[PDB]
Amino acid sequence: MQSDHKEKIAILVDVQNVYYTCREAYRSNFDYNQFWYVATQEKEVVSAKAYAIASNDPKQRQFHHILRGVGFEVMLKPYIQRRDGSAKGDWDVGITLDAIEIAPDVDRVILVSGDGDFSLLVERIQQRYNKKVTVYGVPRLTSQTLIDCADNFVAIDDDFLL
Amino acid sequence: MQSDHKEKIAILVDVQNVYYTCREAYRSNFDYNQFWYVATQEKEVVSAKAYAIASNDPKQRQFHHILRGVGFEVMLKPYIQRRDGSAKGDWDVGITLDAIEIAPDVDRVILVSGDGDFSLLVERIQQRYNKKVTVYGVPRLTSQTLIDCADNFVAIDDDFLL
Numbered sequence: 001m002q003s004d005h006k007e008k009i010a011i012l013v014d015v016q017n018v019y020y021t022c023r024e025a026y027r028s029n030f031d032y033n034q035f036w037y038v039a040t041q042e043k044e045v046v047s048a049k050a051y052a053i054a055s056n057d058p059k060q061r062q063f064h065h066i067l068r069g070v071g072f073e074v075m076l077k078p079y080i081q082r083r084d085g086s087a088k089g090d091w092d093v094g095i096t097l098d099a100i101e102i103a104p105d106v107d108r109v110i111l112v113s114g115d116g117d118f119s120l121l122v123e124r125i126q127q128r129y130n131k132k133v134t135v136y137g138v139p140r141l142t143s144q145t146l147i148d149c150a151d152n153f154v155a156i157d158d159d160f161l162l
Numbered sequence: 163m164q165s166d167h168k169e170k171i172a173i174l175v176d177v178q179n180v181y182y183t184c185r186e187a188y189r190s191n192f193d194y195n196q197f198w199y200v201a202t203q204e205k206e207v208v209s210a211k212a213y214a215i216a217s218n219d220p221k222q223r224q225f226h227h228i229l230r231g232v233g234f235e236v237m238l239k240p241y242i243q244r245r246d247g248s249a250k251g252d253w254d255v256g257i258t259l260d261a262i263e264i265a266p267d268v269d270r271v272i273l274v275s276g277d278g279d280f281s282l283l284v285e286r287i288q289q290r291y292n293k294k295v296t297v298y299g300v301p302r303l304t305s306q307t308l309i310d311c312a313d314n315f316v317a318i319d320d321d322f323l324l
Contacts, residue, residue, distance in 0.1 A: 078282070094282045096254075097258060100262065115248070116242040124259050142245060
């Protein structure tokens with residue numbers, strides 16, 4: 001016999017990617033309340049994490065507070081000393097670690113990022129855990145390889161903008 | 163009773179990071195034969211992978227052939243379509259996936275990269291699998307956070323240059 005459990009989901013948001021791609025494509029901000037509302041309809045939310053950058057700025061701290069209110073655990077990037085002049089803002093390693101960890105516990109991973117490097121992560125979730133992956137991304141700035149790897153792709157467009 | 167098995171190791175080389183950091187610090191190339199020789203002394207090599215960029219250039223193909231001869235499986239980055247103008251060369255997602263996968267099978271992971279974003283990966287290997295991690299990196303271009311996270315740090319300096 002079958003339990004008829006709601007689809008179990010994990011959500012991982014690449015907050016920096018969402019911010020910059022929405023600014024570049026639309027000069028607008030992402031509506032996290034609309035996203036939560038739609039993505040979680042009829043779903044069991046096993047995990048929901050928003051990967052962001054720590055800030056002493058009151059407006060940024062307020063934004064993080066809003067995200068926690070929506071339902072996310074806000075994951076602030078640990079300090080990482082830099083000697084090579086490379087970009088300080090990237091959460092790819094930590095998102096990769098967490099997405100693989102949560103895959104066995106969910107039916108579907110929802111990744112909110114247009115970064116094509118995550119194609120390898122989508123593929124690995126499908127190969128090892130045979131779970132579904134949905135990607136939300138700004139279409140004009142999302143890798144086609146990532147769109148094609150995902151089981152489903154949902155556009156970040158006006159339906160998800162403030 | 164105890165088996166006295168040699169220490170089991172996995173090696174993961176971030177070939178692009180090694181290349182650029184050795185060029186910037188030393189205007190020299192890494193000696194992969196010297197590295198293999200030293201790193202594998204008295205070790206059981208369970209896995210050894212060199213993460214590189216595919217090329218149609220005969221000199222690059224020859225370099226990959228040399229690496230395979232040294233003992234590496236050469237992992238060439240899959241094509242990833244890009245719409246956002248971001249850097250095409252980064253292997254962080256794939257190195258993260260593979261390093262976590264191999265951790266349960268080895269006593270020590272050897273990561274050849276100075277990229278501080280791998281600090282989160284080192285920490286996760288230690289927390290979840292309680293294995294050792296050695297980092298090899300060009301000191302003047304390696305994140306201090308990565309050096310401090312690693313169980314051992316070995317400098318890529320003249321002892322490992324061609």
